[PDB]
Amino acid sequence: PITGLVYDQRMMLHHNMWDSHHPELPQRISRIFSRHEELRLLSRCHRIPARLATEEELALCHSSKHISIIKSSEHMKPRDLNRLGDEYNSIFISNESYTCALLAAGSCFNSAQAILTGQVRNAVAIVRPPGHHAEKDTACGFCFFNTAALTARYAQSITRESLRVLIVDWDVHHGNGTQHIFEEDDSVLYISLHRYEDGAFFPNSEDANYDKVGLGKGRGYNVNIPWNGGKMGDPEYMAAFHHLVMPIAREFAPELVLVSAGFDAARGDPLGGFQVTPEGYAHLTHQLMSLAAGRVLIILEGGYNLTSISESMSMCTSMLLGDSPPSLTPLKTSATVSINNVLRAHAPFWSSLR
Numbered sequence: 001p002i003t004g005l006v007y008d009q010r011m012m013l014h015h016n017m018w019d020s021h022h023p024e025l026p027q028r029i030s031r032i033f034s035r036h037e038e039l040r041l042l043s044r045c046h047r048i049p050a051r052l053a054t055e056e057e058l059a060l061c062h063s064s065k066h067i068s069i070i071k072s073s074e075h076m077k078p079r080d081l082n083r084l085g086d087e088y089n090s091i092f093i094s095n096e097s098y099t100c101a102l103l104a105a106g107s108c109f110n111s112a113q114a115i116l117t118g119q120v121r122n123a124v125a126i127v128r129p130p131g132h133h134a135e136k137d138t139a140c141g142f143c144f145f146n147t148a149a150l151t152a153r154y155a156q157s158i159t160r161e162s163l164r165v166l167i168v169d170w171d172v173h174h175g176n177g178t179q180h181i182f183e184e185d186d187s188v189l190y191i192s193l194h195r196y197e198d199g200a201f202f203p204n205s206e207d208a209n210y211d212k213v214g215l216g217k218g219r220g221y222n223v224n225i226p227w228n229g230g231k232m233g234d235p236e237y238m239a240a241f242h243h244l245v246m247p248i249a250r251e252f253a254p255e256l257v258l259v260s261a262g263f264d265a266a267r268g269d270p271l272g273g274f275q276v277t278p279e280g281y282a283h284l285t286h287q288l289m290s291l292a293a294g295r296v297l298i299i300l301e302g303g304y305n306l307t308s309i310s311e312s313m314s315m316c317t318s319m320l321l322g323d324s325p326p327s328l329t330p331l332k333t334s335a336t337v338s339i340n341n342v343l344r345a346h347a348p349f350w351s352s353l354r
């Protein structure tokens with residue numbers, strides 16, 4: 001009946017040497033860590049050490065070439081770092097980026113191991129750079145390796161291939177990498193909520209639409225909940241969890257839950273433009289804790305308002321520790337439309353939606 005926490009100051013070393021104000025800042029993780037101390041959560045948790053992912057672990061999800069290319073950046077001069085980052089959509093690289101990405105993934109492997117070996121019930125990973133946009137063969141959107149996807153495969157590698165893992169991605173962006181990595185898998189249920197705007201919102205692909213339900217034996221195991229029409233908040237997210245995320249997750253019956261927990265849908269985020277409150281994130285966390293005998297690992301993805309992410313992730317940890325949920329309106333029309341589109345898309349696969 002213990003909550004694990006992983007954080008390591010070394011993940012701050014990845015930085016943007018050309019634009020020190022780029023929103024994916026080092027102090028995202030230190031601010032969140034500090035807020036956990038201030039709220040007296042850190043002393044309630046079991047500290048899990050960070051470690052480097054190995055290259056063989058990276059190969060659970062990534063090509064040898066991709067791994068090789070990111071590793072080669074450790075030794076590059078500034079202009080070669082610039083050139084290499086520019087071969088991707090929305091990436092900056094410093095000499096420390098590869099190590100930090102390794103630490104983010106390995107931290108999460110150690111957390112999943114702690115859960116699956118019974119050392120802890122649940123856990124939180126305060127890590128950067130983020131992961132969910134990283135593809136098999138490429139970096140994207142501040143992400144080098146797909147930490148959550150790798151964690152699902154690492155879990156399978158210490159249990160069985162068919163271990164049922166649910167990944168709930170509540171970052172405001174679509175986890176294109178995660179979707180693609182698991183598109184043909186029925187062992188990993190990917191559920192993403194994300195701002196879409198008919199492709200106007202990053203990463204700007206119709207892959208994120210509600211009709212992408214999975215492929216082959218993975219058909220039904222990819223659930224996209226795309227928002228259109230501007231700001232969404234607690235009412236919409238609670239409704240999506242009520243009608244879609246929780247009924248599907250219960251029917252799937254996961255043995256492990258990973259949260260791609262970006263906090264860029266939060267009130268105050270300059271990129272997300274949404275209004276999810278710390279109390280809202282606490283309720284989402286508490287609902288997920290009813291799955292998988294409580295085996296939930298919360299992995300930081302995006303989120304760029306330092307105060308908002310610190311308060312929101314801390315509230316999630318409070319819920320993992322067993323604190324009672326804090327106290328928390330009709331949905332915007334477009335949100336009803338989105339939810340109904342996903343329900344229609346997934347009723348063929350999930351009896352609970354019928």
Ligand SMILES: NC(=O)c1ccc2c(c1)CCCN2Cc1ccc(C(=O)NO)cc1
Nearest residue numbers: 022023090141142171173202262264302303
């Ligand atoms: N303010 C900025 O420097 C900045 C950087 C990147 C960016 C924007 C602003 C707004 C348009 C889209 N992008 C790319 C981007 C933005 C967010 C993320 C992210 O949070 N993914 O989960 C990944 C990539």
Ligand SMILES: [K+]
Nearest residue numbers: 169171173193
């Ligand atoms: K998402």
Ligand SMILES: [K+]
Nearest residue numbers: 182185188221
């Ligand atoms: K899948």
Ligand SMILES: [Zn+2]
Nearest residue numbers: 171173264302
């Ligand atoms: Zn994001």
